[PDB]
Paper text:
We determined crystal structures of the N-HSP90-L107A mutant in the apo-state and in complexes with representative loop- (1, 6) and helix-binding compounds. However, the complexes with the loop binding compounds 1 and 6 exist in two alternate conformations after L107A mutation: loop-in and loop-out, with increased mobility as indicated by higher local B-factors. ITC experiments for compounds 1–20 reveal different effects of the L107A mutation on the thermodynamics of loop- and helix-binders. Although the binding affinity is marginally impaired for the N-HSP90-L107A-complex with compound 1, the thermodynamic profile is very similar to that of the WT, with a major contribution of enthalpy to the binding. This suggests that loop-binders do not change the conformational distribution of the protein upon binding significantly, or that the thermodynamics of the bound- and unbound-states of the protein are similar (the available crystal structures suggest that the unbound state may be in either loop-in or loop-out conformations).
Numbering used by the authors:
A (entry chain A), B (entry chain B): 16 to 224
Amino acid sequence: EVETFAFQAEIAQLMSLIINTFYSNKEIFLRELISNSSDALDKIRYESLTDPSKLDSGKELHINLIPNKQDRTLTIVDTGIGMTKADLINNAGTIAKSGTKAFMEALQAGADISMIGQFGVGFYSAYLVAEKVTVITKHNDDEQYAWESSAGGSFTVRTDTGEPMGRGTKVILHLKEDQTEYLEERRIKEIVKKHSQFIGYPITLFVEK
Amino acid sequence: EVETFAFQAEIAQLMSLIINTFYSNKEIFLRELISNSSDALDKIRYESLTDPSKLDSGKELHINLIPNKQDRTLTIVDTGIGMTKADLINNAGTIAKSGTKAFMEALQAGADISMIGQFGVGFYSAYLVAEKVTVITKHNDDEQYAWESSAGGSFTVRTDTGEPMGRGTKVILHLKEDQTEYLEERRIKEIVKKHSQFIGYPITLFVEK
Ligand SMILES: O=c1[nH]nc(-c2cc(Br)c(O)cc2O)n1-c1ccccc1F
Ligand SMILES: O=c1[nH]nc(-c2cc(Br)c(O)cc2O)n1-c1ccccc1F
């Protein structure tokens, strides 16, 4: 049922760096996840031009931001192309090994953490605000899977028999106790306006209560 | 045999806007092309994680900048994934319609031309400095093709008979007479340092002669 995998040494080092480096501009995690969501939506939209049946799993191409103060979670949902089990095992669809190597070299040369997305490892900026990240995903060519990691050098992959999503990716951020500002409506609106104003897909910020 | 194609209407409008709008900050074209090269390199790097044989066409993942004052050309070469004939043609079709339309709307609302890359049409910033653009490309699943356009609403596609490149994309900018500063070593170095200082792949600026 649950398979446990060790992260390669470079990715584990990047995750420890993201967690342990003092860096106040944490809000960039949201631009990074929305950017990944936009890329995944572009991929399914492209594939649908030659094969319209690729949208049988859902025609709407959108991004939803779901805060939950009770669970202390911020969920980013997209109806993009999704990820296969193999993509999840490939460090949640990243070029994590070569990307980390190049990003560490850039940091040593004076680059800042906000440039993480240029190295194909933008997803890991989620650990600036989350103690645990759960990735629920459904690709047309595979079953629905749940990827999960609290860092610490390992991640798990299991088949998600739960609520079917049709197609796409759900990123569930289990926020650190001191990062609850990212659950507030006015904070999320401010970040979206600042860093993701020209995203080519509708972004819906859900209300609570 | 040369095939002639019409640009998607919105791209033809964007190209005329890029060519006719007064905009002094032309140097941003380099950042956009290097960004495209970086994305294409990410794609081949990702694909090789599951299939290492995808690097049989070349293991080195890099970007080369080649100025030629004699030919008045600036060439951007990458060893990325490359483009098939279908991609090469269809990139200028219906897929680019929304991003182009959204960019032209953003411009009407006060956005500036330098934001082109946020709309997935950064390639067309090449027409800020070039009177003609030639794109030589080689994808693992197809033959080598040459795309070309001097704008005016059409582009051509033909099989390339010149140097086979193994794998990747070559963007040849036939510079406007008044844009020859982009052939000078100190100008290219200054632009790379300013806009593309921390790319995930090595950038080599070739010396002339
Ligand atoms: O493809 C695909 N599918 N899905 C996906 C995702 C992921 C993530 Br981490 C997130 O957050 C979201 C999403 O949507 N994708 C991608 C994109 C971009 C990059 C890389 C990759 F993997
Ligand atoms: O994929 C692929 N392959 N190749 C390519 C290219 C292009 C261009 Br325009 C340039 O300049 C460069 C390169 O390299 N690609 C891409 C990227 C980005 C975007 C879109 C697309 F198509």
